[PDB]
Design a protein around this ligand. Sequence first.
Ligand SMILES: [Mn+2]
Ligand SMILES: [Mn+2]
Ligand SMILES: [Zn+2]
Length: 461
Amino acid sequence: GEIQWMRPSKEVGYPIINAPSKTKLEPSAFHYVFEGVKEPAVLTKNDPRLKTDFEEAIFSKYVGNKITEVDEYMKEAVDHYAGQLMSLDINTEQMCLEDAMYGTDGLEALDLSTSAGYPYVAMGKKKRDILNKQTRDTKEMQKLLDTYGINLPLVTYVKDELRSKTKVEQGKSRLIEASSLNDSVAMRMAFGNLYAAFHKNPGVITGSAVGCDPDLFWSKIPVLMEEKLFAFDYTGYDASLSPAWFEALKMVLEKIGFGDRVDYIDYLNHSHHLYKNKTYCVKGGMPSGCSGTSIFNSMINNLIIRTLLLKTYKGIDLDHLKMIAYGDDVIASYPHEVDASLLAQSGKDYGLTMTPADKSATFETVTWENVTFLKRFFRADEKYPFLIHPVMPMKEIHESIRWTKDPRNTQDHVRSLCLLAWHNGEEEYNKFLAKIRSVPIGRALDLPEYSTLYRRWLDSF
RNA sequence: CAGGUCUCUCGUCCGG
RNA sequence: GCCCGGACGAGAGAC
Ligand SMILES: [Mn+2]
Ligand SMILES: [Mn+2]
Ligand SMILES: [Zn+2]
């Protein structure tokens, strides 16, 4: 992905949009009980903890477009992936405006608690004004659709979230793209039946984990993988995609029956954004925040991964590839062992910076011991070895609990962390409860017992 | 009061 | 006891 032009948004007829400049993250009652290296991310240029120019750091991720032409291997990839999705029998119809708006089986309703983007954002108009869940009223949305049309610009925002130290000092904050309510509606009418199919089918046919529940899906994953594993994350995924990959995606869509609306994908591939005063244009790069972000990322991953095998391993049989993606996050297997360092080296030709799934510095051999998917480890149960724990490191849970966006959420927050931490086992779970209860507010919370969570887990099978 | 697209789960409240 | 559905809030995860 690459920035085409930044100019005062005054010159282009666009309003100045000014986001909040303050973190909503105050430190938690458990701030000193537990340790951690994470602070809220840099939101503005005037941040003391910055050791670099902010605005140059945030947009740093637009590294350019390596390729623009779907090569022969991308084409065999496209062929094989799209052949996979055929079996799903994915309904290819437009989805009616009422469902695009208020949800249907496999597709949730639009989030009435997040903004309506451009232009509503600068009119002081919100989704609640336009949408009505009780009534499922599509009338005022249609009127807005007629009036403002689609292909509206996205409003860039810095994500208010916890960041490492180097990420605060290097102003490496994450930026989302606030899709307009019009395009979310437009995109979901076009693609809603595809999003639903994906949601309903996490696994190796779709190559996607969107729609999974790790408590239950971890027990499935090993039975779905072939004998030898490899795995990756990527560096700056969305913005490291060059136009070639969008044409490859357009190509998958056409082959599965979405030919007519493949144009929308061009509006993703060439997008306009509003950022504070500026107005800028991007070519390549996934507009994270647009409808389908997750699904298109994971789909492009499946292509990227087939492509790189075909190039690196002559005669590789993609029919014995098994892979699951959640955006750039991927776990994959093949009947014979493949080399992630090599695969990652070809990936650079296509503009991809690839890594170990833990953002570790160097690729190891990947075993059912070191492999991680979505930050979690895999550990067989000791009584029931076919049932597998999603084991997230206590380090992570520690980092979270030390902060709050609002003190009145402590019960839910900590309670939620308990449902992650007990997979580390009774001995580690009870130490957790001890530390939590080491403070007076801790002794106020209703926390679940190891044994209760264990029987819940087993019962849920 | 400002900050996207989603998935999953938990919690609160209301239903069949 | 067991299903199932809705509204709202939170946490985690991907971008
Ligand atoms: Mn990444
Ligand atoms: Mn990732
Ligand atoms: Zn443009």
